[PDB]
Structures are given as C-alpha cells and as structure tokens.
Design a binder for this molecule. Structure first.
Ligand SMILES: [Cl-]
Ligand SMILES: [Cl-]
Ligand SMILES: [Cl-]
Ligand SMILES: [K+]
Ligand SMILES: [Mg+2]
Ligand SMILES: [Mg+2]
Ligand SMILES: [Mg+2]
Ligand SMILES: [Mg+2]
Ligand SMILES: [Mg+2]
Ligand SMILES: [Mg+2]
Ligand SMILES: [Mg+2]
Ligand SMILES: [Mg+2]
Ligand SMILES: [Mg+2]
Ligand SMILES: [Mg+2]
Ligand SMILES: [Mg+2]
Ligand SMILES: [Mg+2]
Ligand SMILES: [Mg+2]
Ligand SMILES: [Mg+2]
Ligand SMILES: [Mg+2]
Ligand SMILES: [Mg+2]
Ligand SMILES: [Mg+2]
Ligand SMILES: [Mg+2]
Ligand SMILES: [Mg+2]
Ligand code: NA
Ligand code: NA
Ligand code: NA
Ligand code: NA
Ligand code: NA
Ligand code: NA
Ligand code: NA
Ligand code: NA
Ligand code: NA
Ligand code: NA
Ligand code: NA
Ligand SMILES: [Sr+2]
Ligand SMILES: [Sr+2]
Ligand SMILES: [Sr+2]
Ligand SMILES: [Sr+2]
Ligand SMILES: [Sr+2]
Ligand SMILES: [Sr+2]
Ligand SMILES: [Sr+2]
Ligand SMILES: [Sr+2]
Ligand SMILES: [Sr+2]
Ligand SMILES: [Sr+2]
Lengths: 46, 237, 119, 194
RNA sequence: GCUUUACUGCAGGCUGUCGCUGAGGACUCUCACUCCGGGAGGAGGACACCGAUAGCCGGGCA
RNA sequence: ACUCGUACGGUCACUGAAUCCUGCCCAGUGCAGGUAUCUGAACACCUCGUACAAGAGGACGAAGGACCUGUCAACGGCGGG
RNA sequence: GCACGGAGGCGAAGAACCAUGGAUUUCCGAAUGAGAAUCUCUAACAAUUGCUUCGCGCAAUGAGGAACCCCGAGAACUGAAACAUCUCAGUAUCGGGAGGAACAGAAAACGCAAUGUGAUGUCGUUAGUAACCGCGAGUGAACGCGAUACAGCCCAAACC
C-alpha cells in the first residue's frame, strides 16, 4: 500500500495507544489496557 | 414477471451502448454560404468503425480537414466539389435541384441542410427520378418513392463497400467482432428458450410460444414481442 | 404600442414638451397616470401626454379611449423620462396632463389641432 | 373619481378580451423564452400588487414564475397495492400551482420572504404568477410601518410553512365556521383530514 | 413464484371531445406553436406536441 | 438508449451448418386491410322536465365490434364413418 | 483531576477551589479560493440573493438541536374471522421549514331562530350523539355550555 501523511499519522497514534498502563498507575490506584490491539489478530480502521 | 431484454435496452446501460468513444466522425455535408467555390482534395481513404465501409479524408480550400461519406470510385488526389454550381461527377455534392434526373445518389438530406439522412449504408444508393420547382422525387434503397425538397443536398454516385453482405460470416467469431463495433447486445437467446418469468413465450414442457405471435400495435412494452402488427406472415399466398 | 394608433413627428413632440415645460411655470399641470386619469374624468384637463415606453402597458392602455369619450385631446411622447423632465420631475412620468395652460394656450391649441388632423 | 388602478383591474377581469388579449398574445411569446424565475422591475398588474402590499421602495422585489400545467407527475407503485392505492393518472397534488410558484421564487431569493402573489395568465402548457418578495434586512423596510412585520424571526421561510395568503386558502382556512372543523388551527393538529 | 378468454383494477396504445387556438361537410390563409438552417431564411401550421376527459384494447403490471 | 447509425440499416421473433426438401387447412384464436348497412361514449346541439338545476329522451357518431377479405416458416389442426 | 506512585513543585506576592466576565482556541467539519478519506495547491463571503458608493463595499441564506410545531409525500402487515369499498391510517416512513414554543386569530361567523352569542387556541362536556358505511366490520364531528386566558388592530381605494 501507499500511505498518505494523514493515514500515517493515524497509524502512528494507534501504535502509541498500544502501549501498557504505566507501573505507577498501579501503585497509585492500588490496582489492564482495555485497548490492546494486535497487528495480526486485529484490524484497524481505513 | 421481470422486464424483458427489449426493456433493459432502453435504459441505455453500457451493455447496450455503441462504442461511441471509438467512433471516428459524423459524415454530414459541409455548410456553404453560396457560390459553390468550395473544393477539396481527397487526402486519404479510411475505415469507418461505425459502418464497416470506407470514408475519405478531404482537405478543403479554406483549410478545413474533414471526413466524408465516400461513394464508390473515390481515391487519394481526386478533387471534390460541394455547391450549387459543383460539377456533375461522382463524389461531388449539390442540391437535388441541380442534379440531372436518372442519376444514382447517396447521403440524401431529409430536410435541406441536415447533413444527409438517406442512403448511407454500404453499396447502396437513392435514384433521383423527377425534378420540379416544388418537389424532387427520389427512389430510396427500400424501393420507396420519397418526395423531397429540391433544395435537399446529396452526393452523386453509390456508397462505397457494395457487396459486403454477399459473403457469409461463416462463424460466430466473425459476427462477434462486428457486433462488438455496434450498439447491440449479441448473441441472441430465443424467447421460447427462457423461463415464463422472463418472456411472453417462456415456460412449458417443450419449447413453443403458448400464443399467437402476431401482436397488436397497441400492445404495451413488455408484451410487444414476436411479429409486430404483421400485415401477414409466412411465404404462401 | 398596442394603445398607440398613430406616430407623432419628433418635431411636433418637441413643441408639445416645450409647451408643457412653460405650462408648469405659468399654468397648471398634473404628474402621474392616476392624477392624469382623474383630470380627464373630472374634465379639468386640456391636453394629456402619454409616454410610449411604458412597461407594463396596462398602466396607460386606458388613457386613449377615456380621453375620446371625454373630448380631451391627447398626444404621445417617445420617452418616459423626457415627459417627466418636461413636467419638472426628477424622475420619469408615464403620463401627464396640462390642467389649464398658461401663456401656452396658443400652442396647446395648435398642438391639439395638429393632432386631430394627424388623425 | 375612479383610480387609474381600477382600469388595470377592470382589464384583468377578462384577460381574453380587448387590448389585454393582444398584450398577452405578445408577452407570452417572450415569457416562454425566459427562465423558471425572472426578476422584474415592475408588477404586470400594478393594482393587484399594491393591493397585496406592494410598494415602490427599496427591499421590494417582484419575480415572475412559470410552472407546468396539469395534475400530479406521479410514479406508479413498484410494490403491491390494493386497487384503491394503485391510481396514478387522475391523482392530483394537494398544493395548487400558485403555491408551488411562490416556493420556487423564495428558493431563488433565499434572503427574501414571500409577501404575496397573483396570476398573470397561462397558455396550454404552463401557468405564470408574479411574486412579491421583501428584503427583511434592508433598513428601508425595517422602518416601514406597513411591512416591518415581515422582519420578525418567526416570519422566516413563511412560505414553506403555508403562512402565505395562497398558503392559508389552500389549507382550507377561509371559512371561520362550518366546514373548517378540520382545518383550524392547522391541518396537522387535526390529524390531517382536512 | 408462475399462468390464463378467473374476479377486480392499474399502467400503456388507439380514437372522439374541450383548452392551447388566430384570420378569410368541404377549403384558403398566417400570427401563435413545431421542425430544418450558423444566419438570412425554409418546411409545416391552427394541425401536431402538451393539459383534461370519454370509448376501445389492455396478465405489460398489482 | 438505439445513433459519430439510415433499409447492404436495426429493431422484434422463429428455425438451427452444408445437401435434398418443406404437402393440405383461414372454420376458431391472433394480426392486418376494408366496410353500403347495423351497433358504438363524452362535449356541443334539439325536445320534455325544472322561473334554474338534477333527470328523461332524441339527433349526430370516432376507434372498436357485427360483416367481408388477406395471412400458417401465425397460434395451431390434418379424425370417426 | 479520575488515581491512595516516585521525584519534584506551587501557595501569606493569599494558591487550590467556586461565580462572573475576558484571553488563547491546531485540522477537518454548513465548510465558503481550488482540490483532498482530517491533507495539499496558488489571495478568496464558494454558491444564491438584496442594497449598491456597481468594488463582495454593506448585508442575507446554508448547518445543528430530545422531542414538541407548521407545510408537503405517503405504505403494508392487520381488522372485516376470505376479500375488492371500508379498516389498520393520514399511522410508519420520506421531502421542506420556523420557534422557544409553534399554528390560529378580530366574522362575507353562529343559526340553543333570538328582543340571543360575539377574534383564536386549549381543557371538561356536548357524545360514541348528528353524520358516514359490502347500512357489514368499523369510522365519527359541530353549535352550545362550564372553564383557562383575554386585546384588539394595520393596509388597498376614494380625497390630497
Ligand atoms: Cl449484422
Ligand atoms: Cl418566504
Ligand atoms: Cl349563541
Ligand atoms: K388493505
Ligand atoms: Mg514500539
Ligand atoms: Mg455522419
Ligand atoms: Mg459490446
Ligand atoms: Mg438464438
Ligand atoms: Mg429452461
Ligand atoms: Mg410473462
Ligand atoms: Mg419448437
Ligand atoms: Mg397610515
Ligand atoms: Mg395547536
Ligand atoms: Mg432541434
Ligand atoms: Mg398476477
Ligand atoms: Mg430448436
Ligand atoms: Mg437446440
Ligand atoms: Mg476546499
Ligand atoms: Mg381479513
Ligand atoms: Mg380512507
Ligand atoms: Mg362480512
Ligand atoms: Mg377516520
Ligand atoms: Mg355548528
Ligand atoms: Na490486521
Ligand atoms: Na427566500
Ligand atoms: Na414461491
Ligand atoms: Na383459421
Ligand atoms: Na475555549
Ligand atoms: Na456570508
Ligand atoms: Na459586490
Ligand atoms: Na381473518
Ligand atoms: Na387470505
Ligand atoms: Na364502506
Ligand atoms: Na343554555
Ligand atoms: Sr487473519
Ligand atoms: Sr447526423
Ligand atoms: Sr448537425
Ligand atoms: Sr412457452
Ligand atoms: Sr404455403
Ligand atoms: Sr424611472
Ligand atoms: Sr432558512
Ligand atoms: Sr439445414
Ligand atoms: Sr383467420
Ligand atoms: Sr375576549
């Protein structure tokens, strides 16, 4: 495929959202990333 | 039921359209103010996709290059004329009034100045019969006597490509190729061979129209199939 | 045009407007199709003018026949704005009536005559 | 005495006779070559316009509109219907042509509001109406004691809601008594049976 | 779903009539309107197209 | 749409290469043509009725039908004695 | 901030926090210079209008909103123990449009017929009455009365 600049920005975002909940959020909230996507198992928009 | 093929046609979808973007040009007579001082030279002979007949490219005095509905016997170099005074030779165009009776003509106008409507097919021709100050009588290819305005322009001679119909296609593949150059859906499936839902003649154990084929002129589209308002049928009598 | 049954010479028209121009400085004149219409109806009119470039024509179609059954003489003017200028208006005027001239009765008198003759 | 206006009026009582007959025969030729909505500097029927609220002032516009003559232009049912709902030919629409005309005019002049309209004839295949529209944003009108009412917010697009004279008549609102049980205060409020 | 001389209707076509629509059971004309022409102009013409209605046909469709 | 197409065209159908052939039937049904006479709606017209109107009847009568003709490589038929 | 971490910071120069008003407010979006799956290309009220100093100079429209409201388009399942008129229903759904509410509204009314009432909504009632209808199934008002709230005016023309 050929990605446009905008397409590329959205792909990047999705990639970033795919990171984990930082360790400290755990301690602070005294105890999951409900948006953990996989390139293979999932399918993004567009 | 479902609309029959004749009805699908009217929508003018791609399947039923002519390969227009592939067609060369409109072969209408040139427009002259008056005088007839219009002459050009046949610069080339070309094949016309839309009619399976040759057409001639002409270069006129004033610099107008245009394709023309060529009669039999026209070749490169030859000079053609178009006007009231134009000479009376094969390949020239002038109003019927100026044409001598008993002279085969082609690309005859229906209304003076339309550019030609009658006798344009391969090897055909109209026959100028009677002259007058009010009516020029022409005999068209179908054998019909047509009364026309003597002011209607035409081209002397018969259309090029005569005899085209004398040789058989021999095979489907040949029909195929010709059909692909026309606004026509081909091949043809018989009505009697379809389902009752697709045509008035469909249905039944064996194939056969379950009704007379001569249909009334007043029949609505969808029902007007078979022999339309036939005045008679068969070969007898 | 549908109400105009005769053409008035550019020169005759010239004399009339002039007569109308002095008619306002001296005598009395009416401006407007309505006021003109009432004068003819009241009979307080000597000569009425009717432009020929009136769109729509219904605004003045009645002037001709109304004047005839009232003996009041009438004359046509080519332009609408001229008639308005002659009547001393800053705008145009579809029709005008000279209600009792003034130091022009001599001409207005002749103008009427010249018209009758002009059929 | 009679107004000059009365004469225009009296002529239009029989548009088929007299001078008017000849004027129409001429005009319609030009009209037939005009568009669907042509703005005009002056009303063809002055008396009627003034009578309907017209005024020679800034913000007052008049436009002639033509519409195809006859009944509805309806498409036959593609799905099953009982004989009753199969009709196609003799069915007519519920809005009269004058109303269709007022709406087209108002669409052409989005910023203007329909004040009123009237007929100016027809031939065998179309009808013409002239429409008086007002510019609610022009100060010459915001100050007119006889027209400033049409400047209110609730008067916006009045024609599209039937607030016109032709609108109100066509909605069966003329009679104040017998026969208007299902028209007043609105067709919709009466279940749409009027 | 399909069929037809099943019942009842609806498109559609033919045909008469009224409006468009004018002048002098057959006729001429030109000015509306139509068509041909780049234009001038030519052809046709109160017909035709279109709106309305009436009779006939009408599994094409419900 | 067909159609930058014009009867050597293209639309609608039937049969299904070549070869040798393709009989009889137009009564019914279909299509088409004609039609003295018959039948055949509405508008306008006339009579009766109504101070008007509803309505009844009359005269005229288009396509259509009756009637006649053409037509089966048109639907189809080609038996019993 | 949700959010109870680590580090670090701010707050008596009165922070946090709350109310009111103001500042900032990327791109796409009615989306309006042209184009485009949120970007790009070379000065912009694009488009339709009114006014007009006739120059986009001054203005209007466009799109949104839970439903409510007004104007148009308008089914069928269903009921009638079938079904076609009828019914379901002017319902569902579709097109257009306004407001904080809409619409209606100062009699060419009513017609308890009168020596009577007196703009218009709406609520209660009048009443499943009158009326409609294969006179089947079903459909179905109004005047009046008791209430709520009340408010009446402006043009066209005549004459100027
Ligand atoms: Cl072929
Ligand atoms: Cl409006
Ligand atoms: Cl009362
Ligand atoms: K039903
Ligand atoms: Mg990573
Ligand atoms: Mg050509
Ligand atoms: Mg093809
Ligand atoms: Mg085949
Ligand atoms: Mg099969
Ligand atoms: Mg069938
Ligand atoms: Mg067979
Ligand atoms: Mg006043
Ligand atoms: Mg309400
Ligand atoms: Mg043309
Ligand atoms: Mg069926
Ligand atoms: Mg076979
Ligand atoms: Mg086979
Ligand atoms: Mg853009
Ligand atoms: Mg039932
Ligand atoms: Mg109903
Ligand atoms: Mg029953
Ligand atoms: Mg009901
Ligand atoms: Mg009542
Ligand atoms: Na994937
Ligand atoms: Na508007
Ligand atoms: Na089925
Ligand atoms: Na037979
Ligand atoms: Na903000
Ligand atoms: Na703007
Ligand atoms: Na501007
Ligand atoms: Na049942
Ligand atoms: Na059933
Ligand atoms: Na019923
Ligand atoms: Na009482
Ligand atoms: Sr996979
Ligand atoms: Sr051509
Ligand atoms: Sr041409
Ligand atoms: Sr069959
Ligand atoms: Sr034979
Ligand atoms: Sr002026
Ligand atoms: Sr709006
Ligand atoms: Sr064979
Ligand atoms: Sr026969
Ligand atoms: Sr009150």
């Amino acid at each position: 495929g050929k990605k446009s600049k905008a397409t590329k920005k959205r792909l990047a975002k999705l990639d970033n959202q795919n990171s984990r909940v930082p360790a400290w959020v755990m301690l602070k909230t005294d105890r999951r990333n409900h948006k953990r996507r996989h390139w293979r198992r999932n399918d993004t928009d567009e | 039921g479902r609309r029959i093929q004749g009805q699908r046609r009217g929508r003018g979808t791609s399947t039923f359209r002519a390969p227009s973007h592939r067609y060369k040009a409109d072969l209408e007579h040139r427009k002259v103010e008056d005088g007839d001082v219009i002459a050009g030279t046949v610069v080339d002979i070309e094949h016309d996709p839309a009619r399976s007949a040759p057409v001639a490219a002409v270069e006129f005095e004033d610099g107008d290059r245009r394709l023309i509905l060529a009669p039999e016997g026209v070749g490169v170099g030859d000079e053609l004329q178009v006007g009231v005074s134009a000479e009376i030779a094969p390949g020239n165009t002038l109003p019927l009034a100026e044409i001598p009776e008993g002279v085969p003509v082609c690309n005859v106008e229906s209304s003076p100045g339309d550019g030609g409507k009658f006798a344009r097919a391969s090897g055909v021709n109209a026959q100028l019969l009677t002259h007058d100050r009010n009516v020029a009588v022409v005999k068209l290819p179908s054998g019909e006597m047509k009364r026309l305005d003597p002011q209607c322009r035409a081209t002397i001679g018969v259309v090029a490509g005569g005899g085209r119909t004398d040789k058989p296609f021999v095979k489907a593949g040949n029909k195929h190729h010709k059909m692909k150059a026309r606004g026509t859906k081909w091949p043809n499936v018989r009505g009697v061979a379809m389902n009752a839902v697709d045509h008035p003649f469909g249905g039944g154990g064996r194939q056969h129209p379950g009704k007379p084929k001569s249909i009334s002129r007043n029949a609505p589209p969808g029902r007007k199939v078979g022999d339309i308002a036939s005045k008679r049928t068969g070969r007898g009598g | 045009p549908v109400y105009v049954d005769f053409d008035v010479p550019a020169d005759l028209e010239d004399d009339a407007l002039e007569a109308l121009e002095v008619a306002r400085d001296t005598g009395a004149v009416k401006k407007g199709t309505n006021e003109t219409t009432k004068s003819i109806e009241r009979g307080s009119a000597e000569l009425v003018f009717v432009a020929e470039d009136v769109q729509p024509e219904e605004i003045v179609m009645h002037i001709p026949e109304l004047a005839d059954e009232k003996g009041v003489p009438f004359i046509f003017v080519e332009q609408q704005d001229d008639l308005g200028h002659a009547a001393g208006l800053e705008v145009g005027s579809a029709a005008a009536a000279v209600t009792d001239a003034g130091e022009a009765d001599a001409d207005v008198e002749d103008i009427a005559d010249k018209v009758e003759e002009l059929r | 005495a009679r107004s000059a206006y009365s004469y225009i009026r009296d002529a239009w009582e029989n548009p088929g006779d007299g001078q008017l007959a000849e004027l129409q025969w001429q005009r319609q030729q030009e009209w037939r070559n005009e568009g669907a909505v042509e703005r005009i500097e002056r009303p063809t029927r002055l008396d009627k316009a003034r009578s309907q609220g017209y005024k020679a002032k800034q913000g007052v516009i008049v436009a002639r509109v033509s519409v195809r003559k006859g009944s509805a232009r309806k498409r036959r049912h593609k799905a099953g219907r009982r004989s009753k709902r199969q009709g196609v030919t003799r069915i007519t629409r519920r809005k009269d042509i004058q109303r269709v005309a007022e709406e087209r005019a108002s669409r052409t002049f989005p910023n203007l509001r329909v004040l009123n309209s009237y007929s100016v004839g027809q031939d065998g295949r179309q009808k013409w109406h002239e429409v008086i529209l007002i510019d609610p944003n022009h100060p010459a009108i915001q100050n007119d004691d006889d027209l400033s009412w049409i400047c209110a917010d609730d008067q916006a697009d009045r024609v599209f809601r039937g607030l016109t004279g032709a609108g109100r008549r066509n909605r069966g609102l003329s009679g104040k008594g017998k026969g208007s049980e299902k028209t007043r205060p609105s067709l919709r409020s009466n279940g749409g049976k009027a």
